Amino acid sequence: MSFPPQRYHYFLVLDFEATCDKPQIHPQEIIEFPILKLNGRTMEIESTFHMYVQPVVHPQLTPFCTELTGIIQAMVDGQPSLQQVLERVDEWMAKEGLLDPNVKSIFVTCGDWDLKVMLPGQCQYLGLPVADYFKQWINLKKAYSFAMGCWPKNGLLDMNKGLSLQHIGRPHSGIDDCKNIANIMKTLAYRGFIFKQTSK
Ligand SMILES: Nc1ncnc2c1ncn2[C@@H]1O[C@H](COP(=O)(O)O)[C@@H](O)[C@H]1O
Ligand SMILES: [Mn+2]
Ligand SMILES: [Mn+2]
Description:
Its EC number is 3.1.-.-. Interacts with PRNP. The protein is of the alpha/beta class. The chain has helices at residues 63-69, 73-76, 82-96, 113-126, 140-148, 155-162, 174-190; strands spanning 10-14, 17-18, 30-39, 45-52, 105-109, 137-139. Strands 1, 2, 3, 4, 5 and 6 form a six-stranded mixed β-sheet that branches. The two termini are 28 Å apart. The relative contact order is 0.20. The structure holds adenosine monophosphate (AMP) and manganese (II) ion (2 copies).
């Protein structure tokens, strides 16, 4: 059945961008924090949280980081740090109605890195508690492997290839990576896939 009933009222698509360098910078710090709120049944985008984040440990973006993500220095200067952005997220969750125990939602990321490595690692570095809704998610690569029966090699690019979808926007932009995740989800639901939590 196309677009079957799903287990969640809403899906929260997330894809961080972080400071980086060649070889990798340490520690990494989140510099882009997007969330797309998807209708649980249709996968349509109904609301968007999007904030750039000011890094503190390594405050100046490297040339590699700007080339990779497209994020320039003026986009993070004057921004709130991660602690404040997380409070903005909580307020946004509240306004969207996602803090109701009877409203079911879950984050969806491309891989496990965002919520298994990046966010809890930086919160630990900062002595910040991770909000409980960040502790369960769906790895799209894993969901795709169940839906299509195959393991994609390179994330969004290869999942778009397998589904004959055109890439949306700019690769390695957090918000655009989110739009592609949402578009892949829409197709998987069209093909009859019911999404399930994959985090452990
Ligand atoms: N090829 C790469 N080399 C170094 N760092 C990367 C690379 N790709 C991604 N990253 C880092 O991982 C973050 C998330 O990328 P992505 O998982 O592609 O959305 C980026 O913002 C960078 O900090
Ligand atoms: Mn990513
Ligand atoms: Mn990305």
